[PDB]
Design an enzyme around this catalytic site. Structure first.
Site, PDB file in Angstrom:
ATOM      1  N   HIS A  61       2.516 -18.474  43.703  1.00 48.09           N
ATOM      2  CA  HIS A  61       1.504 -17.938  44.596  1.00 48.09           C
ATOM      3  C   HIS A  61       1.344 -16.436  44.508  1.00 48.09           C
ATOM      4  CE1 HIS A  61       1.978 -21.873  46.451  1.00 48.09           C
ATOM      5  NE2 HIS A  61       3.271 -21.628  46.556  1.00 48.09           N
ATOM      6  N   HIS A  91       5.697  -8.216  47.331  1.00 41.41           N
ATOM      7  CA  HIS A  91       4.807  -8.978  46.486  1.00 41.41           C
ATOM      8  C   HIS A  91       3.415  -8.461  46.755  1.00 41.41           C
ATOM      9  CE1 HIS A  91       4.781 -10.895  50.411  1.00 41.41           C
ATOM     10  NE2 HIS A  91       3.498 -11.085  50.154  1.00 41.41           N
ATOM     11  N   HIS A  93      -1.014  -9.442  46.844  1.00 37.59           N
ATOM     12  CA  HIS A  93      -2.151 -10.338  46.846  1.00 37.59           C
ATOM     13  C   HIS A  93      -3.292  -9.583  46.196  1.00 37.59           C
ATOM     14  CE1 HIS A  93      -0.074 -12.772  49.947  1.00 37.59           C
ATOM     15  NE2 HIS A  93       0.412 -11.582  50.250  1.00 37.59           N
ATOM     16  N   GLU A 103      -5.682  -8.921  51.955  1.00 36.39           N
ATOM     17  CA  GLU A 103      -5.639  -9.893  53.040  1.00 36.39           C
ATOM     18  C   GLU A 103      -6.173  -9.255  54.310  1.00 36.39           C
ATOM     19  OE1 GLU A 103      -1.667 -11.753  52.752  1.00 36.39           O
ATOM     20  OE2 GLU A 103      -2.935 -13.282  51.852  1.00 36.39           O
ATOM     21  N   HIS A 116       2.760  -6.143  50.049  1.00 39.56           N
ATOM     22  CA  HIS A 116       3.520  -6.480  51.243  1.00 39.56           C
ATOM     23  C   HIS A 116       4.984  -6.260  50.957  1.00 39.56           C
ATOM     24  CE1 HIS A 116       0.142  -9.276  52.700  1.00 39.56           C
ATOM     25  NE2 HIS A 116      -0.044  -8.007  53.012  1.00 39.56           N
ATOM     26  N   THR A 195       1.345 -14.633  56.035  1.00 34.95           N
ATOM     27  CA  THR A 195       0.006 -15.008  55.590  1.00 34.95           C
ATOM     28  C   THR A 195       0.024 -16.148  54.591  1.00 34.95           C
ATOM     29  OG1 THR A 195      -0.112 -13.564  53.696  1.00 34.95           O
ATOM     30  CG2 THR A 195      -0.711 -12.625  55.853  1.00 34.95           C
TER      31      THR A 195
END
Ligand code: VGV
Ligand code: ZN
EC number: 4.2.1.1
Length: 257
Positions: A61, A91, A93, A103, A116, A195
């Site tokens: 992910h 990590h 996104h 996000e 994050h 999230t």
């Protein structure tokens, strides 16, 4: 299993994780004109000098860099937080294009990516226990925009070729996460959630107002990762972001005027 695709993405998560429709879900849109400066908010204390990175991993992910959290080595304190929060992992996104990927949003603006740094409250002893507490985790969120390269990110970018597919990991020791921070620690803060599943409502979110700039070459390397494991149909790991969730009965506080 959950993901970001049409048939397993954020709109589906509530079926396995009903808290997805909960009262303090993340991310949220940060409406800068509604966020209130809170003069009682202390400065953030980001004490990363003793950070001990361990591995970088593609978990299907995102990719994450994990740290030794068995001692107070890299800790977040201050700001809205009571007590000491140990850095466990960071990590990202990111998007398929530069105009999406974050996000959190700021006045509905989406950044190209969001970093994050996930920390957990040492009063709960381990991160698994912390996830079960409303003040168990503190996630420091940092927006990425595309512009000049971020030198402190390059070592991460350099190794992504070695963790292209889900399940791959590599040694990633001696990485200094201070190189990922913007100049300013001005932040917004609000109570929220993970999230990604399990979407636990255990996070004090601290979202920095200043983005970091990364280069197009750096973000392009994020976009060449794969959601799939090796040998499966290649699905590029892009758009691994959850959209903004209802703010509900929450106030976003700003540390700055
Ligand atoms: N996107 S995010 O809000 O920062 C996150 N969503 N799930 C996250 N899970 C974790 O950090 C854990 C790692 C190890 C053990 C428990 C929890 S972090
Ligand atoms: Zn995240």
């Amino acid at each position: 299993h959950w993901g970001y695709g049409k048939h397993n993405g954020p709109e589906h998560w509530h079926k396995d994780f009903p808290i997805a429709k909960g009262e303090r879900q993340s991310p949220v849109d940060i409406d800068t004109h509604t966020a209130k400066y809170d003069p009682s908010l202390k400065p953030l204390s980001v004490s990363y000098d003793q950070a001990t990175s361990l591995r970088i991993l593609n978990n299907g992910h995102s990719f994450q860099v994990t740290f030794d959290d068995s001692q107070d080595k890299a800790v977040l304190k201050g700001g809205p937080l009571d007590g000491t929060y140990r850095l466990l992992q960071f990590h990202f996104h990111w998007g398929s294009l530069d105009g999406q990927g974050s996000e959190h949003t700021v006045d509905k603006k989406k950044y190209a990516a969001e970093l994050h740094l996930v920390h957990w409250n040492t009063k709960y002893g381990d991160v698994g226990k912390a996830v079960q507490q409303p003040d168990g985790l503190a996630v420091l969120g940092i927006f990425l925009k595309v512009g000049s390269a971020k030198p402190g990110l390059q070592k991460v970018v350099d190794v992504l070729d070695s963790i292209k597919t889900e399940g791959k990991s590599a040694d990633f020791t001696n990485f200094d996460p201070r190189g990922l921070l913007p100049e300013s620690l001005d932040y917004w803060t609000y109570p929220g959630s993970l999230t990604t599943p399990p979407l636990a409502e255990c996070v004090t979110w601290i979202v920095l107002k200043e983005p970091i700039s990364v280069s197009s070459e750096q973000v392009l390397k994020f976009r060449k990762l794969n959601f799939n494991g090796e040998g499966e149909p290649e699905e590029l790991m892009v758009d691994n972001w959850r959209p903004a969730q209802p703010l509900k009965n929450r106030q976003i506080k700003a540390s700055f005027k």
